[PDB]
Symmetry: T
Subunit: 139 residues, 12 copies
Amino acid sequence: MSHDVKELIEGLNEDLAGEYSAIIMYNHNAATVSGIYRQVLKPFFESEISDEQGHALYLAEKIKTLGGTPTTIPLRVKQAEDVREMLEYARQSEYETIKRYEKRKEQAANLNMTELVVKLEDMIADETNHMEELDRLLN
Amino acid sequence: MSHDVKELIEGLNEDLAGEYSAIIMYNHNAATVSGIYRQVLKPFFESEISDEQGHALYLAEKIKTLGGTPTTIPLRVKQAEDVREMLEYARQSEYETIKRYEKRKEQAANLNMTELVVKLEDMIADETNHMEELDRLLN
Amino acid sequence: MSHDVKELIEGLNEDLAGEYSAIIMYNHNAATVSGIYRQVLKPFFESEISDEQGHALYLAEKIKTLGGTPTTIPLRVKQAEDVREMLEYARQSEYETIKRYEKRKEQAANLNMTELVVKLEDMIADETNHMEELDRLLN
Amino acid sequence: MSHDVKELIEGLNEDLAGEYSAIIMYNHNAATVSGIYRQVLKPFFESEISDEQGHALYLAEKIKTLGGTPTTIPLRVKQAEDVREMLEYARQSEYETIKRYEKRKEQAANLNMTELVVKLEDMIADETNHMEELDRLLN
Amino acid sequence: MSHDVKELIEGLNEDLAGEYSAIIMYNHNAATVSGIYRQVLKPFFESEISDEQGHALYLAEKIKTLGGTPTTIPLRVKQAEDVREMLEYARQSEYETIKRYEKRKEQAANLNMTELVVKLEDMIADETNHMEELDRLLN
Amino acid sequence: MSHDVKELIEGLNEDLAGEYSAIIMYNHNAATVSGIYRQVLKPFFESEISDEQGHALYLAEKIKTLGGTPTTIPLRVKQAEDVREMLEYARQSEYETIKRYEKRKEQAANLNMTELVVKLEDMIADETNHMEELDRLLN
Amino acid sequence: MSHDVKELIEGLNEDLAGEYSAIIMYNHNAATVSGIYRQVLKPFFESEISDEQGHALYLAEKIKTLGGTPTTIPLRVKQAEDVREMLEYARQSEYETIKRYEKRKEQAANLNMTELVVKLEDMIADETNHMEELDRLLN
Amino acid sequence: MSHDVKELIEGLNEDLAGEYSAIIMYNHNAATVSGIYRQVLKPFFESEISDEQGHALYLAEKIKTLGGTPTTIPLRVKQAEDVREMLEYARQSEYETIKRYEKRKEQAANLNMTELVVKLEDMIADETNHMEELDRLLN
Amino acid sequence: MSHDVKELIEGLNEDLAGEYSAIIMYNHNAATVSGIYRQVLKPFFESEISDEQGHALYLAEKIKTLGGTPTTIPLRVKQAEDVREMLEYARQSEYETIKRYEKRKEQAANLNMTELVVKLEDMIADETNHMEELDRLLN
Amino acid sequence: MSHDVKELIEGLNEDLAGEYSAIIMYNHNAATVSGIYRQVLKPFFESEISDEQGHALYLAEKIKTLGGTPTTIPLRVKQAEDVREMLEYARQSEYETIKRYEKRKEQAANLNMTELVVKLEDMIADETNHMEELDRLLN
Amino acid sequence: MSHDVKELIEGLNEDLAGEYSAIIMYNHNAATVSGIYRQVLKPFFESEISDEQGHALYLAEKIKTLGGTPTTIPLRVKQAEDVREMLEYARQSEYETIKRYEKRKEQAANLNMTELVVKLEDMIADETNHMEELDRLLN
Amino acid sequence: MSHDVKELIEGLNEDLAGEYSAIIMYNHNAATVSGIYRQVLKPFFESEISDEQGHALYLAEKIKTLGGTPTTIPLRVKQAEDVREMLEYARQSEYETIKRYEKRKEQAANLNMTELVVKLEDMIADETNHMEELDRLLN
């Protein structure tokens, strides 16, 4: 374990904690969203659950493959007092998730990790899709 | 909010924390299980994820419906050092989940909550199914 | 035909009239709901149609099985002048349907009717699900 | 609202009452048909339910679109004392439904209502299909 | 193994023998039913096969889980000389199966066995469904 | 090529330009609709795309079959500054599409073109369906 | 009924008893198999159930068609004390089933029974497939 | 073209005429069968249509492959005055179809035509299945 | 039976003979078409089979419903010596089928037969679709 | 809006006009392609329609997200006088589409736009797939 | 291992080498076929891949079951300079595959190997199907 | 053909030989894997077959597109004497496949081949997925 690999694993573990956090947040939002648009927003929140589950699985596998230990401790979920807030906090969570992945991409690239760079580019594309959609919903 | 309703909500919130914990545990176990039986056990762990997600959703909805606030903080996941341990700790988690639900059933019954009793009986039946299967795998 | 069986049949027949009424109400609401959320609410109303159809079928079968005659006369549908009213009147109809089923459950239980109690508990759980959802839409 | 449009709406409302009546009749017949051919006839009755539901939806939408108020009061269902009667009364109900639609077609045609004429021609074709099948079953 | 658990296992084993017997009976009836209604009754008999297979599986699993040995010896199948008899003997077999399950339910309830009571209530509901249908076919 | 056939082809070509225009408009609206109801309206717009594609295909085939040349130049799409406008302009486009098809129907009828009249009647019914739905969304 | 047909029917009836026995054995093995490979072996056992059900149905039909009476009495199931034994006894049961079918094939061939020979050849091919697979699992 | 190949082609052409005849007969019977069991028998007749279509296709292909010309002239269909007759004449048609195929099998075998023998054995098995079913319906 | 109904039945019977003829022709063409485009044309021919089967069924049902006897004697199939001819003769057959249906439409219209006119208009539209496609293939 | 973002938006808008143009071209080609290979080429053209629709949607969304206005004006479609030309002009259109996307990729890369680069690389891969296939068809 | 079993295994191993060769050939032909009919022929070649894969699997399993070692060395693939050649060489490969299987059938028959004879007869029927189709494409 | 293109084609041809080799290896391993985990490993091996088939197809197409000739000669398959070896040799084969693709990526990148780089990055990601899974199975 190089220093760079140690620091990449610490990063992936941050990513994984953020992914478990998102899974919790989206279940919570699917359960609690109210008013007529609940009929709209619940399936939306629910669809994000499966997506993030797939990222969580990929990350914990990669951590283990690199010789690390995958965390089981999620980041905190911000408490949303209404639907606007629920969408803004999901958007901010996505923004931070992408920021982290961009950093992880330059870590992976720097270590010549081809498959991991491709996958981080794809997870970036995917989370940017979600964030851009939340912006459309909000504006 | 009666005292009994307050205490039932505290209980449901315990249940919900335990459900988010199980979702984390099962993703973690699907990612990290190794050896030839990984091919067997990963889909098993994965199937439990969707099940527990449905319980988490039901509970957070019910908590909100009863006037409470659903938690987003999961219970800790016990760290498993090998596959036997992974199965024993999943079994123990299920055992505690059923113990809690049995208590919640007598709370719900005591408040004449028909739909909630039916649903707790079903979640009990379902988790007992899983626990009994883990026993078959272990023995 | 005991007196108790006669009174249980009268009850089931009330239930059946209320179920045909709900089928009418939900078709009517699917047809007539307007504004942008029509796109949301029409499928919701439509989904309730099939559910209530299944209850209507079960009840008329049970009535006949107990030696009664199943009614073909529905309860009146309250006329809704706007969408809020449409949701409140559907909610109230569900509330009355559950009240009746709870009474029928204690009738069925009192006559040791196992299969019928299980089914009334399930129809209670199901209608309570719908009513709780309408509350989320309304609040 | 012309006089002709008023009279066309009165007609559609008759049609709609007859459609809710048919939905009730077919559920009732699916529930209550007996003997070995119940295995044959129940699915037949059940299939007609969904068909008539689609006509009910179309009519209530059209009534509202033309500025009328869609009824929620069904026609009476004739009480059938045996299977032959059940098939004869379903056949007669279809016969009356087609008679009404033929009248509505000449109303719609007279008002140059293209889409409505096409749809009444199709509902006529569809109900004639059902009536002809009932004749095959009966003879 | 308490005395009560021993006696509950003896009961489940009776149930299991009766379930293998029903699986045999229904295959036999699907094979041998004749006349035009064979086209009706064969799929009916066939559908019951899969149902009873699922009960057989549940029971043998539960027996093993409680520390017993699941039997592989079925009850006798009554020989049916014609279709009426075939339906009456299937009905009687269902009647006896429900009688046994009701007894097993009070055994399971008496031992506070939540999941097993829920499952026996469901198997009761399911077999009562089948028996009631056979009555409709017969009358 | 009669004069009447020439004039019918000119008409179909207008229709085809209007159909390519609608395909563009609906893609554009699916992409650009914003706010929470985007979740509702995007699938709606998207569904209209496939419908209009099928009309475009039918028309270009018919034009070619009648000896004409199908245009590839769409009508202009009106620019919508907000969601209300987006729905009003889609409604107006549908209104003009139906007006044109009604004219084409009397052209086709006048030339005894059976299959083409049936198809124009159906496209009229279909576009009237869409226009009536837009009215429900708007009112 | 020739002597040869009588002896062929006795044979088919042996086959049928052996098929009901296999259906029992495979349900029993699906229920009771334990350890991690239960996850592997249960679906395997379960798949054999449907296969043997189809042979049981074919045989009872053929017996009846030839003028015989199909048995409802299964062969005994050997009791397996562990998984190795469970696989060896399933293998031996298949071996005996094929031995019998080979004998039945020369009976059917000797009576010029084309369709029955084709079907016995296919059931032989199918059971040999299963037996060869059990050998792979065992070795 | 040997004499044997010429005579085999004449045979296949008889078979093909008989197959087109069966396709006609079964469509005719699906259309015209009456009374309550029409609901049973129409799908049965319809299923035979697709089967015979596949035999017709195979035969015309084989005829062409052997250097012959496939006929387009069907055998006559016997006119059935009621349902019993409809089933007896379908049974007799199947009987004659199998008789012919058995003859064709010994022709194909005699010319060492492996693939054709396998296929005639299968078509024999298939038509014998149908004939045996008709016998069950009739008796 | 009016004279007009007699003459309409004679017409339908012509139509039905032409439909059985088309079913034969298309099977024959699917079997015998050769060269690389066989891969293209066989599925095309095959798709027409199911279409014409549905027309044959409708016609024989209608004939019987009007009090006539449906024919089982097909029109002759023209023998095609190559693929061009196969497409030209299918096209000509379609042309004659449409000519007949147009005549039947004015017969049905003249007798005020709404459902039958709608269905003949649809069969006309459908066969014109096929004929126009054959023209595209040929030119 | 930087100068670079303005110039990237102008580029995307070119891309979008080219995508609407391709959607028109492919519908047009699906409608108008003739001769036996129409059966081959029509589904090919049709498949490209859905692909390009997805690119059009992505681009208009991205334009809006970057603060631009998505165009609704397509590029001209080159008129193809025969099938060879139809394939050459589709190929050339794809060639120009890829040339543009390669330029847009270096624009997006230059602005560090990760998700947009990934998506342009994918659209490049996809259009290159189509162009290479057209080359195989042409050569 | 008898001499006959040794010689049968040598034969199966020839068959297996020929099957891997066919899998290579068909992938190669799917990749490289050109001109407009590529759209036709590529799916054809592709379909043969899965078929031959299933034969390869069966053979290697049987070889191992008989105590032999399955080869991993394919026969050479003849290089095809154009589409005609590609079809002729696929046809010749099929011809040789059938010749070999016919020899293997008389080997298997001679050793009384029932299941293996049935399977070789089926693989013969299947490859003869393919060869006959190639002849239709070529002629 | 530049020198660089010649050397890139030689590389792709190495890749293609390695892909046909993997297809052979995985079929061979699916056929021959033994013991209880055969039930686990056979589907795993089988899934890799389809994956590698898709790479083989892509490569042979690309080789042809670049003006080369795609090889039909596979690399040798290492002979595995047991399951551990089977997994280690599959892992090593994947390792060498990725090493080659990484080299091909820098060749493709060096020639500015966008679509080919994207596809090699994806095939790298995909094979790395498989190799990492084999490591989990092995450790």
